[PDB]
Design a protein around this ligand. Structure first.
Ligand SMILES: *P(=O)([O-])[C@@H](C)NC(=O)CCCC[C@H](NC(=O)C[NH3+])C(=O)[O-]
Length: 345
């Protein structure tokens, strides 16, 4: 690979701050050589600087943790990707032809209940932040809507799919998702900054605060740091750090977390758009210099995450800006992958 471009990374972060991120930071693990940059503040009220060791909410990177647990269950003979969801969770879904594989690749047609919750950004956050949902509560909210397409037929990203994933994990193992994440992933990879504390609202240890951008342009930011994330759970509630998500995605892509057969299933790409695919709880992004990278994005209120690795896991990058509902920042932060993998023009 090209050398990572730290001057480019620096410019990305500075641009994100100019667009409304209080803080922005990035870590690259380039085959044993670290790159780390940060600009701005973890807490905008106190002025404390952001750093690459600050913990944060990784959002839908959680779907890749959930997918690794499910694929290990496939390896163990406890789950068949082409069985119907209702085989394991009887009566859950209106159509017994919706399969596990379809849920994990967002081809199930299940409506995303968070489109209702977050039609208005700050009121929707204030509505859910202190609520505790069961898995079933969220499935019922989705099923109030019709499915959006026939089983398997269309890619439509939906958090409901990884709510189903959490239910599957808990039913087939008899354990909570926290216990499964801990035993299967956090402990074996020594992810000392990685937690699943749902429904606790506290972020353990030193962390970036999150700042939700309101829908009104120029409006004051809302501190969104402490919330249950119960609206997402196995679709979005993990806490981690840049070092730990680099460790995780490198371990995944280098073949340490499941059999070769299940990793190949995880990387069967469904088209998202002309530069992106979705596997099983895994994204592919195609970068301008002809390199594809693999991992996941996250958005929860106040936190935008990118965490991606090369195909062989030897280079991994995690970037965080502590705002959300700010597409300028979101688009800018994607450029960290360009600078880190494609290098200098
Ligand atoms: P993942 O990270 O894809 C999953 C856990 N996150 C989402 O689906 C996004 C949730 C909504 C995020 C907020 N947007 C709005 O409220 C839009 N009105 C945001 O914080 O940007």
């Amino acid at each position: 690979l090209p050398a990572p471009d730290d001057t480019g990374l620096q410019a990305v972060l500075h641009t994100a701050l100019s667009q409304g991120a209080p803080g922005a930071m990035v870590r690259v693990d380039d085959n044993g050589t670290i790159h780390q940059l940060s600009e701005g503040v973890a807490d905008r009220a106190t002025g404390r600087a952001i750093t690459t060791t600050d913990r944060f909410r990784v959002g839908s990177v959680t779907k890749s943790f959930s997918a690794v647990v499910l694929l290990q269950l496939v390896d163990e003979g406890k789950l068949d990707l082409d069985a119907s969801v209702n085989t394991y969770l009887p009566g859950l879904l209106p159509d017994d032809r919706i399969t596990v594989r379809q849920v994990m690749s967002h081809r199930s047609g299940l409506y995303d209940y968070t489109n209702d919750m977050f039609a208005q950004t700050v009121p929707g956050f204030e509505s859910v932040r202190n609520k505790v949902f069961s898995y079933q509560d969220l499935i019922t909210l989705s099923l109030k809507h019709g499915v959006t397409n026939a089983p398997g037929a269309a890619y439509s990203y939906s958090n409901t799919n990884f709510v189903v994933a959490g239910m599957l994990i808990e039913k087939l193992t008899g354990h909570s998702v926290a216990t499964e994440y801990q035993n299967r992933i956090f402990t074996p990879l020594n992810l000392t900054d990685t937690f699943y504390v749902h429904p606790d609202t506290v972020i353990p240890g030193t962390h970036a605060n999150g700042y939700l951008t309101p829908d009104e342009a120029g409006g004051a930011l809302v501190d969104s740091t402490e919330q249950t994330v119960s609206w997402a759970q196995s679709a979005g509630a993990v806490i981690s750090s840049t070092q730990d998500l680099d460790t995780f995605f490198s371990a995944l892509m280098s073949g340490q977390l499941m059999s070769a057969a299940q990793l190949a299933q995880m990387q069967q790409w469904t088209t998202v758009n002309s530069t992106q695919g979705y596997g099983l709880g895994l994204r592919r992004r195609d970068l301008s210099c002809g390199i594809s990278v693999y991992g996941h994005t996250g958005t929860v209120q106040g936190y935008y995450t990118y965490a991606f690795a090369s195909k062989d896991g030897k280079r991994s990058v995690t970037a965080l800006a502590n705002t959300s509902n700010n597409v300028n920042v979101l688009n800018t932060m994607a450029r960290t992958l360009e600078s880190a993998f494609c290098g200098k023009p």
